[PDB]
Design a protein around this ligand. Structure first.
Ligand SMILES: *[C@@H]1O[C@H](CO)[C@@H](O[C@@H]2O[C@H](CO)[C@@H](O)[C@H](O)[C@H]2NC(C)=O)[C@H](O)[C@H]1NC(C)=O
Ligand SMILES: *[C@@H]1O[C@H](CO)[C@@H](O[C@@H]2O[C@H](CO)[C@@H](O)[C@H](O)[C@H]2NC(C)=O)[C@H](O)[C@H]1NC(C)=O
Ligand SMILES: *[C@@H]1O[C@H](CO)[C@@H](O[C@@H]2O[C@H](CO)[C@@H](O)[C@H](O)[C@H]2NC(C)=O)[C@H](O)[C@H]1NC(C)=O
Ligand SMILES: *[C@@H]1O[C@H](CO)[C@@H](O[C@@H]2O[C@H](CO)[C@@H](O)[C@H](O)[C@H]2NC(C)=O)[C@H](O)[C@H]1NC(C)=O
Ligand SMILES: [K+]
Ligand SMILES: [K+]
Lengths: 875, 875
């Protein structure tokens, strides 16, 4: 591990991000859309790329930066899914970028260097735009096969050629800028011929004039014959437009001044078939024939803001190239982000400055002319260069061929990596390699896809697909980062100093909008294939890890949610009850109190969680069938009571030991239960053995030991069935000094049912004789009215000296008289359960008085909190 | 509950589905696109509607069909979510349908019945198409407020007017078809004026001729003056086109023959500003001035297939109207589907037949003329009617006004219902109602939205928005049905005889494509708002049911997945191991064998679930802190071993009782554990108490009683840490007569780790002397090669007479000698664990001899299945 930061990540990213659009389709961009819109487009693309770089840096800061490429980092940081989709998108982008590079190199070879090097000439104006496409296809396939053979046998020569090509691009840029600086003092002389208001083409004729002077006489020029098909100057059978307008010679490079910048500062789009047009030149109007149109210059494609953005976008892709040597950096956590960001910044600055230079040095005629038709078949960008345009042409050609080489040697690499990681089946056969490791069948697949792309044979028509794939990958990386940060995933801590999920969300939205505005059907199909591959990967993973069923990807979801649930710290406010239900089974293996199940169902109304549990005496090794039958019958009984939950039965030797074990064993980590529901012991005096009720008390102690809310309804046989409706009544809630957090909440949560909806609460808190409640009543009423739940509230009590719940037998009947006289007709009574016996011997007399505390009442529901259970909403 | 099927669901659905597009913009559809394309569009729309009807019928067959409207049915059948989104989409669709109906009524009143009833006249050709829009806005707002007041005070009159309007529509259709039949014998005389190839407008001038005969002389007509601005026939200062063509009187209704159908059988689109043209009429070519263009007929909008589909789609919406009276049908499960399907079928048949009639009776000129400009300002559809066009005009006007009334009285209904169900907060204030129940502020909201829609003031520009909302609702209902069926959700049993999830998926795809092809930005914004409201509803539900945190919607997901997990029947093939880990804690509350955790981590490699458990002796009521500390320290220790799972600690009085309870208590319903991992007792002879090892044996019995796979590694101290890598070795697997299902699977699952990846399996199954294994070796090799996992396989054994695992002490050493000689150098040894002791007294000597099977060996991993455990992949 020994590599610098400039040599490790800066230079490779710089050479990858720079491309051929800068040398072929940037002056056209500035000319056809104006300086302001050009800067706007560059700014938008730079913004999405920079936000994606921020997200990539956040990814690269997390973890330990596993060695090997850039796909491995994303896969390790974002799970097995979100890696296959982005991997395939990147692969398709690389394999189409190779084809685009081949097409650009072929174009440079054909229209600039050696025009005679053509197979099928486009003879005649008829069917002009087919021979060029056929030549493109032929040369593309020949170059593709030759370069596949070149990258087959040897690769290290290509490896050093990479630095060669970077040097070529650098010298090209410096040449351009030196020429731009020289343009201040004295510009090069590259005249352009002008006819009326439109522009001619100088490649065919020689002199830009109507009539010339030869042999001491005035004679019509070659332009006269080529435009009027009449070698006699007296004929008038040609276009009236030529005889109605008059010719000039405009300097192709006027210099770098303010006026030239002001002239072409505004947008001027065009439609296919129109003529690139000057703005400030005088000209009359007249019709024209159809034979003269071939001897003009014409826009080859309809131009628009969206189309221009789509064409320009590939000129900024290549951000993720600064991770191919991730296993070699001396400092992985630091070098990658700063290097990537600096590379993006310097490319953006060069783009801005070059756009301004083109706007302020070349007029709107040359810039709006692809292929340099208006200027002697010459490259427009090379007109500015200092020594000569040929250095620019050679540098562009070498850089384009080299970029094709790296793309074609890089796509099989990640295809083989994805294949060897074994997440998609057929990639397994697509994965085999040579003895050293160089791919041997994936190269054929990428060659076939590159040939398919070349078959289109149009540089402008291929760039949008490249843009779609790269934008789609960027959308997934941004979305993954944003969601992972927001929803608290474990093992995701991007300790980067300038990261925020809002930035990732904003970049996602911005260049999602870019992806859709550019082309909606390509975006739609890309999204469909990405979603399909994501779901297929998820299904394969579920089949592999789990029992290989259609239920696997539900078990996976449950496990993933339960693992997410561990990161958060418990607990905040807004306490809600979660119920554990304890039942007793008759000697005939049948339930005893289904009304308790009905009550538990109507309290939660099908929300939250409920775990019904039971205990069967006996050994486990000889009573498995009994437990298996009891679980099934409890499951059947729960279905008819409209309660949704889970069941559990544990065979044990001691029933109280089984209950104690069930107290904290039910539920998984974080998915626990919050409260316990247990019944009342009926006829304990009838039974002679204390064990009929002592176990009861024991359970309470455990519920106090585990800090769990305890609910013990009494007279469950009188509780209403799930069918009997109620039309009128009053639910009394006798709040006392403590545990008021939920005593005012249970009526609110229970009101949301078809049974008790008609009733109204009658909270009747005690008014101790020590201090009156004139203002306390107002404060409590204000607190109730501030919350959603509100009802009649009063303050009344008979005595305060008696110490019942202060920290004591007469105080039981003393309050019982008031309760019975004031709440005899109430439908239901919420009441605070007292504390457990102080010592072990205090149990008996305990059971002595709680029942006379509820003697005479029909229905009571004793409640104790024994925990923290703070509440904020509603209550 | 007493209602028929024709009066309950057929007639209301028929009345709702028929609209104003049929009477205003259907002849235009047939004229501008041709019969074939019209039939194709109608077929596509009918297909999506019919598939949505199939899905709706499947929904209506499930459950008990809860009473009240149609929103309640969807909400009950598809959960609280997917109901709010579709509810809001339906509400917006209805409140824009009201505006569209108002606009259609305004147009009918303005351009057909009383032209003078205008406020802002469009004087002059300048700014012509804005005064009409202003008139539309003024009349729209005045009738909006008037109709809001009408539906405010009284509604019963509107209720009977509904049947009135249905009768009006029926009589209108009957009149149209009677006129179509009459067209066979003798057609009505409605001449159209023709100039050359283009068509004039008869509303302004009177006679369609060049020069008339008056006062026994030849005098130029009013057309001469209105088209040449010269009351003298000798002038020639007007359009040359008029002087080079002719004038004819083409019959506007030629009859119903084959030739007329053939003439307009092909598509003919047009662009905005163009003139409708006859196809077979001869005419010369000449230029024209700009003063004559106003005295022609012009297409008011650019026409295309997509635009025409978008305009036509609202003419089929209204399927869900056959569920408003759901709480009153005599038979809910049967009447709704058949009635809805029959209504859709009869509407489709009427649409097809009327399209064919229009194609085969009316020429392509007037059909392509909106507002009937070419025929005396007359409605085109009313030209065919038997008595007179006025009956059609009156019926259309009354039907449109009534449709607006029902839309405006229906939207507040479901708005109030959604508000009262309390799923979105501000709907609470939007929900207040009068004493009877009629809404009082929701009506204000829908009135404002309808006013906003009318502000557009264009019938064609409003229909696509309705189409988008209705299609979005249909997309959600179809997607919900398809996913609900596929993922085996509980409480979803659509017992309909003609339902299949493939149909719902196909309809979803088809009119998702419709929604996107019509307009992509409207579709995008609709999807964004639907997704946002869905997520907001989910978040609010999580906050309400759960502890009101950002973790709520993860608990909800876990619960929902575990509830889905119960429906499926266990278990299919492809057994996979799920581990429960048993640990012993030192007296100093510290772990003993972290190497066991490392082994459990490398065996699963972060897949499946792992539930570590422990047991602490003592009472629970006084040892809570010990358990709380032990759980935390085990959680800390698990993190460094790269194992992901859950922990559980249970305080108990008997350690073996705690283990027995932990056997089946860990995990929830369906999220259970499949196998148990327990260590080996070291130095049992050193200990005098049998409980040091007897408990061990006891655990095995429980694992046999619960039918759970048992794994007991020996010499765990020598097992490698997850850091020490291995370069060479051999993992011996000594398979025996039984339990071969996973003995060949454990090496395959364990191979996928960075430590054991270098090793290779050496399966060495026994070759009993009873029968050779020459062909059995070939069969086993074929079975291995068929699966992914394969390795060296041999057959060897020293004797077969000895009965070791047949159902016995010398047979231990007899096999031990062979094992030690043939597998001494192996890295790891997989071996089949024998059966438990036959009786209780057979435990001791049991522990006597198993160890001689492992005597001398370094690492052994004894395995027993004790279950079913069938495997299909790989193995
Ligand atoms: C030749 O180019 C210029 C500008 O189009 C014209 O030549 C002279 O300049 C003015 C400006 O148009 C003309 O109106 C004069 O008639 C020209 N002659 C002078 C000033 O002596 C002229 O318009 C062009 N030639 C033709 C035939 O159009
Ligand atoms: C260039 O000069 C011509 C006059 O020779 C300008 O006039 C346009 O001529 C074309 C051809 O008939 C018309 O279609 C346009 O409508 C004319 N433009 C008008 C009338 O504004 C032409 O605009 C000039 N081009 C520029 C200034 O870019
Ligand atoms: C209608 O008749 C005209 C001749 O009066 C046909 O000719 C068209 O004329 C316009 C106006 O100049 C041209 O733009 C078209 O190109 C002509 N079409 C031809 C020559 O085929 C016109 O086609 C007729 N339209 C029909 C039959 O639909
Ligand atoms: C307009 O009408 C005249 C009618 O005279 C057409 O002239 C045709 O040729 C001679 C000369 O009048 C007549 O005998 C024919 O009967 C005329 N009609 C036909 C169909 O041949 C003239 O061709 C018409 N111009 C059109 C249709 O553009
Ligand atoms: K690039
Ligand atoms: K309708």
């Amino acid at each position: 591990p020994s590599m610098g930061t400039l040599m490790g990540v800066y230079l490779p990213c710089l050479q990858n991000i720079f491309g051929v659009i800068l040398f072929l389709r940037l002056t056209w961009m500035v000319g056809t859309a104006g300086v302001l819109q050009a800067l706007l487009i560059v700014l938008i693309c730079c913004c999405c790329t920079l936000l994606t770089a921020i997200s990539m840096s956040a990814i690269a800061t997390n973890g330990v930066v596993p060695a090997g490429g850039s796909y491995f980092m994303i896969s390790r940081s974002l799970g097995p899914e979100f890696g296959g989709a982005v991997g395939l998108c990147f692969y398709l982008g690389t394999t189409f970028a190779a084809a685009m590079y081949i097409l650009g190199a072929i174009e440079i070879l054909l229209t600039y260097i050696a025009p005679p090097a053509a197979i099928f000439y486009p003879s005649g104006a008829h069917d002009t735009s087919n021979a060029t496409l056929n030549n493109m296809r032929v040369y593309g396939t020949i170059f593709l096969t030759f370069m596949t053979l070149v990258v087959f046998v040897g690769v290290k020569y290509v490896n050093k050629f990479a630095s060669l090509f970077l040097a070529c691009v650098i010298i090209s840029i410096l040449s351009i800028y030196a020429g731009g600086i020289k343009s201040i003092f004295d510009p090069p002389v590259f005249p352009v011929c002008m006819l009326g208001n439109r522009t001619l083409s100088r490649d065919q004729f020689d002199i830009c004039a109507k009539t010339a002077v030869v042999d001491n006489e005035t004679v019509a020029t070659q332009l006269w014959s080529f435009f009027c098909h009449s070698p006699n100057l007296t004929t008038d059978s040609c276009d009236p437009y030529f005889m109605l307008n008059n010719v000039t010679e405009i300097p192709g490079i006027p210099g770098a001044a303010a006026g030239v910048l002001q002239e072409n500062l505004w947008s001027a789009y065009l439609e296919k078939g129109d003529i690139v047009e000057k703005h400030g030149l005088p000209s009359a109007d007249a019709p024209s024939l159809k034979e003269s149109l071939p001897l003009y210059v014409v826009a080859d494609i309809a131009t628009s803001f969206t189309v221009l953005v789509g064409i320009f976008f590939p000129s900024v892709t290549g951000i993720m190239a600064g991770s191919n040597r991730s296993g070699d950096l001396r400092d992985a956590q630091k070098s990658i982000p700063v290097g990537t960001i600096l590379a993006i910044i310097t490319t953006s600055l060069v783009y801005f400055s070059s756009v301004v230079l083109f706007g302020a040095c070349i007029e709107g005629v040359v810039l709006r002319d692809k292929y340099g038709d208006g200027v002697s078949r010459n490259l427009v960008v090379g007109t500015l260069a200092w020594p000569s345009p040929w250095v620019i042409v050679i540098g562009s050609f070498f850089s384009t061929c080299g970029a094709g080489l790296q793309s074609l040697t890089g796509a099989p690499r990640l295809l083989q990596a994805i294949a060897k990681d074994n997440i998609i089946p057929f990639l397994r056969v697509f994965g085999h390699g040579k003895v050293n490791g160089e791919p041997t069948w994936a190269l054929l697949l990428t060659a076939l896809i590159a040939e398919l792309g070349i078959l289109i044979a149009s540089l402008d028509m291929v760039a949008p697909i490249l843009s779609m794939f790269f934008l789609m990958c960027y959308l997934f990386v941004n979305l993954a980062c944003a969601v992972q940060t927001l929803l608290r995933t474990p093992n995701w801590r991007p300790r980067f100093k300038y990261y925020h999920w809002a930035l990732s969300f904003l970049g996602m939205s911005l260049c999602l909008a870019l992806m859709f505005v550019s082309s909606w059907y390509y975006a739609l199909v890309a999204m469909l294939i990405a979603g399909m591959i994501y779901k297929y990967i998820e299904y394969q993973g579920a089949e592999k890890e789990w029992g290989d069923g259609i239920r696997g990807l539900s078990l996976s979801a449950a496990r993933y949610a339960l693992l997410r649930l561990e990161e958060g710290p418990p607990h905040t406010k807004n306490w809600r009850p979660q119920l554990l239900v304890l039942l007793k089974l008759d000697e005939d293996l049948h339930v005893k109190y289904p009304r308790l199940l009905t009550f538990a169902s109507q309290l939660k109304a099908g929300k939250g969680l409920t775990i019904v549990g039971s205990v069967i005496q006996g050994s486990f090794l000889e009573s498995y069938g009994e437990a298996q039958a009891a679980e099934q019958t409890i499951k059947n009984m729960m279905e008819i009571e409209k309660v949704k939950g889970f069941c559990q039965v544990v065979v044990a030797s001691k029933v109280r030991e089984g209950l104690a074990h069930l107290i904290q064993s039910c539920g998984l980590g974080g998915m626990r239960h919050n409260s316990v529901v247990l019944g009342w012991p009926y006829g304990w005096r009838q039974s002679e053995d204390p064990r009929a009720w002592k176990t009861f008390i024991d359970t309470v102690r455990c519920t106090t030991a585990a800090h769990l809310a305890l609910l013990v309804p009494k007279n469950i046989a009188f509780y209403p069935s799930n069918h009997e409706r109620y039309l009128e009544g009053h639910i009394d809630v006798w709040w006392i000094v403590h545990d008021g957090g939920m005593l005012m909440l249970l009526p609110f949560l229970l009101r949301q049912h078809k049974v008790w909806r008609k009733c109204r609460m009658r909270i009747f808190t005690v008014a101790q004789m020590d201090d009156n409640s004139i203002q306390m009543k107002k404060d409590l009423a204000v607190f109730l009215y501030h919350l959603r739940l509100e009802a009649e509230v009063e303050v009344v009590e008979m005595h305060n000296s008696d110490i019942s719940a202060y920290t004591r037998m007469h105080t039981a009947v003393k309050l019982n008289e008031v309760i019975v006289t004031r709440s005899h007709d109430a439908r239901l009574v919420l009441l605070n359960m007292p504390g457990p016996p102080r010592n072990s011997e205090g149990d008996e007399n305990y059971m002595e008085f709680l029942e006379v505390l509820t003697e005479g009442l029909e229905r009571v529901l004793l409640v104790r909190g024994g925990g923290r259970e703070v509440i904020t909403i509603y209550s």
